[PDB]
Design a protein around this ligand. Structure first.
Ligand SMILES: *[C@@H]1O[C@H](CO[C@@H]2O[C@@H](C)[C@@H](O)[C@@H](O)[C@@H]2O)[C@@H](O[C@@H]2O[C@H](CO)[C@@H](O[C@@H]3O[C@H](CO[C@H]4O[C@H](CO)[C@@H](O)[C@H](O)[C@@H]4O[C@@H]4O[C@H](CO)[C@@H](O)[C@H](O)[C@H]4NC(C)=O)[C@@H](O)[C@H](O[C@H]4O[C@H](CO)[C@@H](O)[C@H](O)[C@@H]4O[C@@H]4O[C@H](CO)[C@@H](O)[C@H](O)[C@H]4NC(C)=O)[C@@H]3O)[C@H](O)[C@H]2NC(C)=O)[C@H](O)[C@H]1NC(C)=O
Ligand SMILES: *[C@@H]1O[C@H](CO[C@@H]2O[C@@H](C)[C@@H](O)[C@@H](O)[C@@H]2O)[C@@H](O[C@@H]2O[C@H](CO)[C@@H](O[C@@H]3O[C@H](CO[C@H]4O[C@H](CO)[C@@H](O)[C@H](O)[C@@H]4O[C@@H]4O[C@H](CO)[C@@H](O)[C@H](O)[C@H]4NC(C)=O)[C@@H](O)[C@H](O[C@H]4O[C@H](CO)[C@@H](O)[C@H](O)[C@@H]4O[C@@H]4O[C@H](CO)[C@@H](O)[C@H](O)[C@H]4NC(C)=O)[C@@H]3O)[C@H](O)[C@H]2NC(C)=O)[C@H](O)[C@H]1NC(C)=O
Ligand SMILES: [Cl-]
Lengths: 207, 207
């Protein structure tokens, strides 16, 4: 019999009003006998029906895969609304049901500090700009780097680490050629989190 | 004597209601002799006071460098209000002033097309996904790439090029390992411009 998996919107979709977040219900392992599959979507227990379901597609193990996609209102998701997908298909005895929702917990607003590179580090070819993001809950967060215009490639972020007061912190490290840092170029760490004003803050840093 | 330069907001900052746009006034070639510099900000003729001046930072020239940022309203900038920085130094015969505004001109809407890699490029271990953005005005624009919610590394973008019909176009090229493309991953080019509905559009691309 089939399998269903239920995928949440990615955080930055929920946090920007410009972008458009979606919940995705996918069923796989549906037999060739009865390829037809019905989706029922509930938001907080009431049926909704603006979901786009796409045409079924056969995979190379000779079973179909079909996906149903529901656009969510940003505020609905951020207010902890439960999204439930219910799949019916003739091979199942009882229809099967998944539910997801934003991670629970009292939200906490992160502080965002930028740390210039250590002086022992500027004897080197590349240098590291550091962004400390601490005090935030829940752990859904986005951290990015920009420079006088366009995004930066060469950065890595730590996974959220549980701190001693129950909130998370993390660090983001951006490595730049030292000649760019020495020229007074400005680099910005932007953070997106549901607990910030406007879900967005930015801290700049330069020599 | 002291030079004056005045930089506009970052396009992304003006197009997103959650980000926060600033006009920046930089003064360089500041002498030790008469070190104090006072700024005076004017929106559409009338004076303003919420500017933030960061204290002087001396350079390797032994010149000084003084900056003052003014936060602007998104709508004020998009509606063409003129921002004027007037700077006084007791080593200037007359205070010196500059003025910026959004690029004048009727706004045209960009068409966004995504172009897969050439069949000839599948010989290499990396391939180029292409994003063509054409028919837009003014040239203040932001292009970014992403995949499964996260910002995609590489990609470079051309400057806007004046088309024959009065508008601009640009291309953005993203380099992915060929295996990532052949697997079926979905990449997406997102674009931000005044003339787009919601100032934002996304176009996807995948094998
Ligand atoms: C003393 O040292 C300082 C420090 O310089 C720094 O250290 C030295 C050792 C070197 O490493 C330098 O490379 C390094 O910058 C010197 O201060 C510099 O002084 C020069 C000239 O005096 C200035 O040049 C101007 O640069 C701007 C662009 O500058 C931006 O881009 C740089 C990126 O490479 C960046 O380093 C700058 O900081 C600045 O970055 C912007 O910053 C803001 C806020 O921080 C940010 O929000 C922006 O996003 C960011 N932008 C970018 C793109 O990064 C340039 O625009 C100027 O061009 C005008 O003048 C040119 C010559 O005339 C000409 O080519 C242009 O067309 C333009 O001409 C003017 O055009 C307009 C119309 O469009 C009109 O208003 C004018 O009439 C017209 N003409 C004139 C005459 O104005 C210009 O090239 C540096 O910015 C400045 N450095 C800094 C950090 O501010 C200083 O010169 C030294 N003193 C000496 C040697 O005696
Ligand atoms: C027949 O083929 C199909 C299609 O596959 C294709 O053909 C085969 C032959 C191969 O060649 C494939 O390579 C080829 O692609 C098979 O379909 C697959 O079926 C398996 C399960 O049978 C599914 O596994 C699940 O995977 C999800 C995560 O999947 C995401 O990430 C993948 C990359 O790693 C990506 O390929 C997927 O498409 C999917 O991508 C997401 O897509 C959404 C929507 O488009 C998008 O928004 C997201 O951005 C994107 N996400 C990412 C990360 O890219 C995984 O979550 C599941 O894990 C559960 O089960 C594990 C085992 O128990 C467990 O360890 C996990 O924790 C999790 O367990 C559950 O978790 C919670 C609590 O922990 C709770 O719900 C449950 O209690 C718990 N337990 C259980 C049991 O559920 C899961 O592993 C594949 O996704 C699916 N592939 C596709 C493309 O749909 C099919 O299986 C084949 N049939 C056979 C062999 O008989
Ligand atoms: Cl990037």
């Amino acid at each position: 019999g089939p399998s269903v998996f239920l995928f949440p919107p990615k955080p930055k979709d929920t946090l920007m009003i410009s972008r458009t977040p979606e919940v995705t219900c996918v069923v796989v392992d549906v037999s060739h006998e009865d390829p037809e599959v019905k989706f029922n979507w509930y938001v907080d227990g009431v049926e909704v029906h603006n979901a786009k379901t796409k045409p079924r597609e056969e995979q190379y193990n000779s079973t179909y895969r079909v996906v149903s996609v529901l656009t969510v209102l940003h505020q609905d998701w951020l207010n902890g609304k439960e999204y439930k997908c219910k799949v019916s298909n003739k091979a199942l005895p009882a229809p099967i049901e998944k539910t997801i929702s934003k991670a629970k917990g009292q939200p906490r607003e992160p502080q965002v500090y930028t740390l210039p590179p250590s002086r022992e580090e500027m004897t080197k070819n590349q240098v590291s700009l550091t962004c400390l993001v601490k005090g935030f809950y829940p752990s859904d967060i986005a951290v990015e780097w920009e420079s006088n215009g366009q995004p930066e490639n060469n950065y890595k972020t730590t996974p959220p680490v549980l701190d001693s007061d129950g909130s998370f912190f993390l660090y983001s490290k951006l490595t730049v050629d030292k000649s760019r840092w020495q020229q007074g170029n400005v680099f910005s760490c932007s953070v997106m989190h549901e607990a910030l004003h406007n879900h967005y803050t930015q801290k700049s840093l330069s020599l």
